[PDB]
Structures are given as structure tokens and as C-alpha cells.
């Protein structure tokens, strides 16, 4: 019962049991039927909260080592293994169900999933070293770029997905690519694109993302 498990994820989220929540949205996705607007949010809320738990616990342990120095290192890797397991799981849902079943002219769902795709490849790169890093950075770039071309072509600069895509892509350039100017340029362009069309504004979502762009622009 698909209606059953969507309620399960709404229940799990209320109990803030996000491991349980993402399993329901996972189950819902693998039935090969499209997701609604609220269903896309649930899946996005579910997996970002699980990754946020690994990547938060990872940042308090990796900063330590940077016999006692081994267990610090081995504990860092085990949290690292759990972090990659969650990313590859949601990346499987994107490649095998969500992005794959998308229509040609379903730009919002397309940019949304591709933005998610680039995000979790960016979370991978934050813990990545050596050969595996160079791989996940390029895929993140490949996913961010395709959503950028679709959003800049068919979506209003005030759309919270096109704004949220500009802020995560500019963060990727700054943190993972160390390209401060292209990060500044991409952030500043969309933020000014949105101010040029501020008269087009559910405006609170767009306004908050426009301020994070200026916050990041000032800190860069």
C-alpha cells in the first residue's frame, strides 16, 4: 500500500526518526511511480537529515587526529563508511528510479533530482581522498551543471529550486573546487537575476535562499 508508507514517513518525521523515514521514502520510490511535490520534500528531508547526522559526527572526529591516534582514525572511517552508504543509496534512487522516469519537459523534478544528485556527491567529496575524490567531484559537477542549464533556461530566477541550485553549486565551487571567483560569479549572477525579477514572488522560501547567497558572497 503506497498510501500506507507515505503516512509512515510523515509519522517517522514527526518522531524525528529519520533513518525510519528515509526507508519509507526509499520503499515508496522503488515502486517506480513518480513523486508529488510533498513526496519529493519528504525524500529530500529524510535523506538530508540522515546524511547530516553522519557528516556532523564526522566533523567532530576528523578534527581530532588532524595507540590513541588509531582508534580516532578507525572511528572516523566507520562514520565515513556509513556516510557513503547513505549517499550511494539515495544516488541509486536518483539514477535508477527518479531521474530516469522523468519526462522531457518536467524541469522542476529534473532540476530538483539533479540538484540532489550533485549534493550527495558533494557530501561524498567532503570525506574523500585520493582516487575516489576526483571521481565524485566530477559527477557532482556533471549533475550540478545539467540542472543549472535547465534552471537558467526554463525556470524563473526567483524559483526556490533555481535559487537553491545556485547556492549549492556556488558552495561546491568554493569548498570542493577551490574556485572562489567562479563560486562568487555563479552566486552573484543568480542573486542579481532574482533581484532583477523580485516582482515575481510562498515568497519566504525564495527570500531565505537569496539571503544565504549574500551571506556567502560577503564571506567570500
Amino acid at each position: 500500500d503506497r498510501e500506507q508508507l507515505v503516512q509512515k514517513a510523515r509519522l517517522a518525521e514527526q518522531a524525528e526518526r529519520y533513518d525510519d523515514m528515509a526507508a519509507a521514502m526509499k520503499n515508496v520510490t522503488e515502486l517506480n511511480e513518480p513523486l508529488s511535490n510533498e513526496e519529493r520534500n519528504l525524500l529530500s528531508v529524510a535523506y538530508k537529515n540522515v546524511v547530516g547526522a553522519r557528516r556532523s559526527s564526522w566533523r567532530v572526529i576528523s578534527s581530532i587526529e588532524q595507540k590513541k591516534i588509531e582508534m580516532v582514525r578507525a572511528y572516523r572511517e566507520k562514520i565515513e563508511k556509513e556516510l557513503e552508504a547513505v549517499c550511494q543509496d539515495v544516488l541509486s534512487l536518483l539514477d535508477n528510479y527518479l531521474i530516469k522516469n522523468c519526462s522531457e519537459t518536467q524541469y522542476e523534478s529534473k532540476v530538483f533530482y539533479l540538484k540532489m544528485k550533485g549534493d550527495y556527491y558533494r557530501y561524498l567529496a567532503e570525506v574523500a581522498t585520493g582516487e575516489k575524490r576526483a571521481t565524485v567531484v566530477e559527477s557532482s559537477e556533471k549533475a550540478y551543471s545539467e540542472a543549472h542549464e535547465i534552471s537558467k533556461e526554463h525556470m524563473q530566477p526567483t524559483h526556490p529550486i533555481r535559487l537553491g541550485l545556485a547556492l549549492n553549486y556556488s558552495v561546491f565551487y568554493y569548498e570542493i573546487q577551490n574556485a572562489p571567483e567562479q563560486a562568487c560569479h555563479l552566486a552573484k549572477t543568480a542573486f542579481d537575476d532574482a533581484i532583477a525579477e523580485l516582482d515575481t514572488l510562498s515568497y519566504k522560501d525564495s527570500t531565505l535562499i537569496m539571503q544565504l547567497l549574500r551571506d556567502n558572497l560577503t564571506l567570500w
Binding site: 549534493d119 547556492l167 549549492n168 558552495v171 544565504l212 551571506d215 556567502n216 564571506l219 567570500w220
Partner: peptide
């Protein structure tokens, strides 16, 4: 660490 989308 910069600010991403919530």
C-alpha cells in the same frame, strides 16, 4: 564551511 540550502 559555507552555507548551503536548508
Amino acid at each position: 564551511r559555507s552555507l548551503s540550502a536548508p
